[PDB]
Design a protein around this ligand. Structure first.
Ligand SMILES: [Zn+2]
Ligand SMILES: [Zn+2]
Lengths: 65, 103, 343, 51, 46
């Protein structure tokens, strides 16, 4: 649904690096170089950010509003 | 009510003692095991966990001669405390000189 | 000879092709004949040393020489779990119209770190849900999303159409209790990162809540863990059994880390040597080359531990290590006092 | 606007189009995929060469 | 006592009393949700 704040394995703060990651996707950066620039050395945070699906906007499209 | 002693049998033999320590885990158990294993008067030192649900550990100490096995316990505790104080002082001094040389 | 093998077993940990050997700590009295491994405080204070190699905000790296694996693991576990911090525990909700569930919202708020100094607070007693000035903190979060009165005709992006549609943790306002406003200057009590995305809203929805934070340790729950990654590794020391030169030496530079093996032209020919064994991660890729297996000997120093501590930003990591050592000292003192009370 | 940017220059930046047109990322992506391909370190290039 | 409800598409606060045909003004939708309560609820971050 939404990006988790904490990483499951280590616990590094990753929720604050989601939208900026999307910015790196709006820019010309690929996946690997963007994850490297975000400061994710260990592969657990890379999996957390890469394998995450942004389903919050799809649900808000069905929100009452 | 945290640390309780238990003799090896009803005979109340001071050679083999079991210390049950509450609200502890592998950290202090292993640290005290390492700090007291170097005591030459200890034949057998060993810590174990009764069950992962409850937070308690059981250490067992068996000495060589007629040691009450409580004196090595206090010896290991004091040695671990001294080691911790020394490493704390060394780390503080190291951090201080690093901050000084960085600026 | 036999003495060299004994020294290698008691000082080095060798990594083989199929398994690691000499992994158990054995320097104890009675295990070795020609060695008096009895405890000596003077020798320990002489041989032990701490050297910090890197220290920035929320990151520390330091090598300890002379300590054992038991005390190193104890320090690591105390840092991971037994260091108390401040984190959100109670969530009082007033008309949460968000799509995000209330329990999920409370769970996300609990994982948000707090920059408050834990040493200035105390543990809340059993019960006492009302909380006191000493052992709690209050954070008010009130965000009402609404349509932007001035926007483009299309406004496809949600940023232009709506305002406050993404509830960042910067909207959290610390509400002082009693005399906490005078003790803590403005700006000290606040979220650590200030950019954590809590939830996303739509016009009409509102998120109103209060968060009660109390002191707690990481053993009870992972949200109190101050360190993100606090670990230690044995310092590698790669040694060459025979001098390797020629193009195969370049293979060494490609087998190990790029920054550990360096090739030099002493007489016009390339010869490889160990430059900085610290940068090596022991990928064990030298075992693939058949010829170069019997020319190197990968090993780890037993009494040299490089600690890497990356924290979540609650407090600098040096203070974290100091508080971990203080917690271990407090456990030792509590057990000594209990033993003295027994006798 | 995208076709005009392509007529003016062969390379088109996605972020610039998203900022100017004020559109979402998916609409700009669909507009670009119909007539452009992603070239690393260069942005979006027209799929067919200059005829 | 004013009992308030929310429509499924207009999302407007409509006040209807007992034994009324479930409907909503300026539309014809017949799905009527209840507003969230005003009582304080305590949650645990565990
Ligand atoms: Zn991670
Ligand atoms: Zn309606």
């Amino acid at each position: 649904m939404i990006i988790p704040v904490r990483c499951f394995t280590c616990g590094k703060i990753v929720g604050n690096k989601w939208e900026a990651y999307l910015g790196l996707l709006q820019a010309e950066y690929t996946e690997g170089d963007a994850l490297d620039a975000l400061g994710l050395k260990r592969y657990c945070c890379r999996r957390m950010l890469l394998a995450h699906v942004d389903l919050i906007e799809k649900l808000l499209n069905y929100a009452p509003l | 009510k945290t640390a309780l002693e238990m003799v090896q049998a009803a005979g109340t033999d001071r050679h083999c003692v079991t210390f049950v320590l509450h609200e502890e885990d592998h950290t202090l158990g292993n640290s005290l095991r390492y700090m007291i294993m170097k005591n030459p008067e200890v034949e057998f030192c060993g810590y174990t966990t009764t069950h992962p649900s409850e937070s308690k550990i059981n250490l067992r100490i068996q000495t060589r001669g007629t040691l009450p096995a409580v004196e090595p316990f206090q010896r290991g505790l004091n040695e671990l405390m001294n080691v911790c104080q020394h490493v704390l002082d060394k780390f503080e001094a190291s951090i201080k000189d690093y901050k000084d040389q960085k600026a | 000879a036999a003495s060299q093998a004994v020294e290698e077993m008691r000082s080095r940990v060798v990594l083989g092709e199929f398994g690691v050997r000499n992994v158990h700590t054995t320097d104890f009295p009675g295990n070795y004949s020609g060695y008096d491994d009895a405890w000596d405080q003077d020798r320990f204070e002489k041989n032990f040393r701490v050297d910090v190699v890197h220290m920035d905000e929320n990151s520390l790296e330091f090598d300890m020489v002379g300590i054992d694996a038991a005390i190193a693991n104890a320090f690591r576990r105390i840092l991971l779990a037994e260091v108390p911090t401040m984190a959100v525990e109670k969530v009082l909700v007033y008309n949460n119209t968000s799509i995000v569930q209330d329990e999920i919202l409370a769970h996300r708020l609990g994982l948000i770190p707090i920059h408050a100094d834990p040493r200035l607070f105390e543990y809340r007693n059993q019960g006492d849900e009302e909380g006191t000035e000493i052992d709690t903190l209050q954070f008010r979060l009130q965000v009402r999303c609404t349509r932007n009165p001035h926007a483009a005709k299309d406004s496809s992006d949600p940023n232009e159409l709506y305002v406050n549609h993404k509830v960042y943790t910067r909207h959290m306002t610390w509400i002082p209790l009693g005399n906490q406003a005078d003790l803590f200057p403005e700006g000290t009590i606040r979220p650590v990162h200030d950019d954590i995305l809590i939830a996303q809203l739509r016009p009409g929805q509102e998120i109103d809540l209060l968060m009660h934070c109390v002191k707690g340790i990481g053993k009870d729950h992972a949200k109190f863990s101050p360190v993100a990654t606090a670990s230690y590794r044995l310092l590698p020391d790669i040694t060459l059994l025979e001098p390797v030169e020629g193009e195969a030496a370049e293979e060494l530079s490609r087998c190990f880390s790029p920054g550990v093996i360096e090739v030099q032209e002493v007489q016009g020919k390339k010869v490889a040597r160990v430059a900085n064994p610290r940068l090596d991660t022991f990928s064990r890729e030298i075992f693939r080359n058949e010829k170069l297996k019997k020319v190197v000997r990968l090993a780890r120093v037993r009494d040299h531990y490089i600690f890497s501590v990356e924290s979540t930003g609650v407090l600098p990591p040096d203070v974290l290590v100091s508080e971990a050592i203080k917690v271990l000292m407090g456990k030792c003192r509590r057990f000594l006092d209990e033993l003295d009370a027994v006798q | 606007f995208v076709m005009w940017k392509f007529t003016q220059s062969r390379w088109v930046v996605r972020k610039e189009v998203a900022t100017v047109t004020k559109l979402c990322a998916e609409d700009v992506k669909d507009f670009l995929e119909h007539m452009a391909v992603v070239r690393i370190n260069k942005g979006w290039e027209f799929i067919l060469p200059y005829d | 006592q004013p009992m308030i409800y929310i429509c499924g598409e207009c999302h407007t606060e409509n006040e209807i009393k007992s034994r009324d045909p479930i409907r909503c003004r300026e539309c014809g939708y017949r799905i009527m949700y209840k507003k969230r309560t005003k009582r304080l609820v305590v949650f645990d971050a565990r």
